[PDB]
Curated annotation (Swiss-Prot):
The lineage of its organism: Eukaryota, Metazoa, Chordata, Craniata, Vertebrata. GO terms for molecular function: cytokine activity; growth factor activity; identical protein binding; interleukin-6 receptor binding. The chain holds residues 47 to 212 of 212 of the full protein. Belongs to the IL-6 superfamily. Keywords: Acute phase, Cytokine, Disulfide bond, Glycoprotein, Growth factor, Phosphoprotein, Secreted, Signal. It comes from Homo sapiens (Human). The gene is IL6. The modification Phosphoserine is found at residue 35. This is Interleukin-6.
Length: 166
């Protein structure tokens, strides 16, 4: 078992939270899977994973994929701020997914041997992105929380298979 093995075991907890953070805000969200479809074609602005990154069999890299995970978790952190207080009923569950998602940001920058820290998105610019998720109508607002849990589910998933394939 190495610090990397703990990095994966920690992301698995991140998704366990998203379950309690995407079950209520998906069925009773009329914008995820109410009972018809819920065209979620908004696509927030937090993309960062594909076949070019190297997080899949096609050119499965190692330092390029894990890198996208460090900066991918920092941006994910501002979106966690979204679900860090928006959850007033299950606020505890929202803190269970954010606290862990932070445990990976520090556990990586520290155990990122043979890496680069992957820098991080300035908080001043991330202040405008967050002001933008909240500057959307009530409709686009409930959708922002949806797509966020959509990346955490998939995005984090590939992060685990990338740390195990490394």
């Amino acid at each position: 078992l190495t610090s990397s093995e703990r990095i994966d075991k920690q992301i698995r907890y991140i998704l366990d939270g998203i379950s309690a953070l995407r079950k209520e805000t998906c069925n009773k969200s009329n914008m995820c899977e109410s009972s018809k479809e819920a065209l979620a074609e908004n696509n927030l602005n937090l993309p960062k994973m594909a076949e070019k990154d190297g997080c899949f069999q096609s050119g499965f890299n190692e330092e390029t994929c894990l890198v996208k995970i460090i900066t991918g978790l920092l941006e994910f952190e501002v979106y966690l701020e979204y679900l860090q207080n928006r959850f007033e009923s299950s606020e505890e569950q929202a803190r269970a997914v954010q606290m862990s998602t932070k445990v990976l940001i520090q556990f990586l920058q520290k155990k990122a041997k043979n890496l680069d820290a992957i820098t991080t998105p300035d908080p001043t610019t991330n202040a405008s992105l967050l002001t933008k998720l909240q500057a959307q109508n009530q409709w686009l607002q409930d959708m922002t929380t949806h797509l966020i849990l959509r990346s955490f589910k998939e995005f984090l998933q590939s992060s685990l298979r990338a740390l195990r394939q490394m």
